[PDB]
Amino acid sequence: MIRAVFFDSLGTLISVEGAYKIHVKEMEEVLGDYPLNPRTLWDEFDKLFKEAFSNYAGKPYRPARFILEEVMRKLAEKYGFKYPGNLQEIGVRMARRYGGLYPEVVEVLKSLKGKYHVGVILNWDTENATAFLDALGIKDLFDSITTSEEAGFAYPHPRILELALKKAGVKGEKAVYVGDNPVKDAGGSKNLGMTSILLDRKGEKREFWDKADFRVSDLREVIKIVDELN
């Protein structure tokens, strides 16, 4: 019955502890020798980039590289540090150095890939998203990489999922959907017939429990769930 498994957003693959490290080390490289706290610069930057990026939700996609540069450009002015080019390429380097994938990702992707179409969906730019997956070492494990830039709209928008399924050549009813935030993923409260799996690593997402077919704290359960559905 099931022919494709999709992972939406990097929260289903990267841990909060690993993500925060890459982010911390990201600002470290940006500041260099300039006397600024990387912890605080991340706080203001993450706050500002969220504001700017949220204004495009479900609307025609503007690449994040241009929204990041503007946010970073303003911070450089505010605090008086040089802007060392695009942050996107710095992130790929930090992911290379420190990683941050959940311990079982590569194992789970490897098993599913032998039986089903394993695709990933991201609310990011196509080029950088692929480079980031390569840095983590899981790019070649996916049968398809679908992004908001390719679909033309930011999260949420049906064209993203529609295109992901088009790549796999399967209908939604024959696909599984792994996400970590139902109100911040590609399909929003929409799936196209897909069987949803909510990743709650800590069991602290009660508000999202009732809007997901299955719940798991370990991605290896995605193997069993998909297996039983067949």
Residue numbers in the entry: 1 to 230
Question: Please, what does the article write about this entry?
Answer:
Previous work has afforded the MBHase BH32.1413 which promotes catalysis via a histidine nucleophile. In this work, His23 is replaced by Nδ-methylhistidine (MeHis) for the creation of a more efficient MBHase. In this study, we explore the evolutionary trajectory of a BH32 variant with MeHis in place of His23.
Following evaluation of >18,000 clones, a BHMeHis1.8 variant emerged containing 23 mutations. More detailed kinetic characterization of BHMeHis1.8 reveals a kcat of 4.5 ± 0.19 min−1, making it 13-fold more active than our previously engineered MBHase BH32.14 (0.35 ± 0.03 min−1) and 2000-fold more active than the original BH32 design (0.13 ± 0.01 h−1). During evolution of BHMeHis1.8, Arg124, which was essential to catalysis in BH32.1413, was replaced by a tryptophan. To gain insights into this mechanism, crystal structures of apo-BHMeHis1.0 and apo-BHMeHis1.8 were solved. Efforts to obtain structures complexed with either substrate(s) or product have thus far been unsuccessful. Comparison of the BHMeHis1.8 and BHMeHis1.0 structures reveals that the 23 mutations installed during evolution cause minimal changes to the overall protein fold (secondary structure root mean square deviation (rmsd) 0.47 Å, Supplementary Fig. 9). In BHMeHis1.8, MeHis23 is positioned by an adjacent Trp42 residue installed during evolution. Molecular docking of (R)-3 into the apo-BHMeHis1.8 structure reveals a binding mode with the aromatic nitrobenzene ring sandwiched between Trp124 and Phe132 and the polar 1,3-hydroxyketone motif pointing towards a newly introduced Glu26. Instead, Glu26 has emerged, which mediates a rate-limiting proton transfer step to deliver an enzyme (BHMeHis1.8) that is more than an order of magnitude more active than our earlier MBHase.
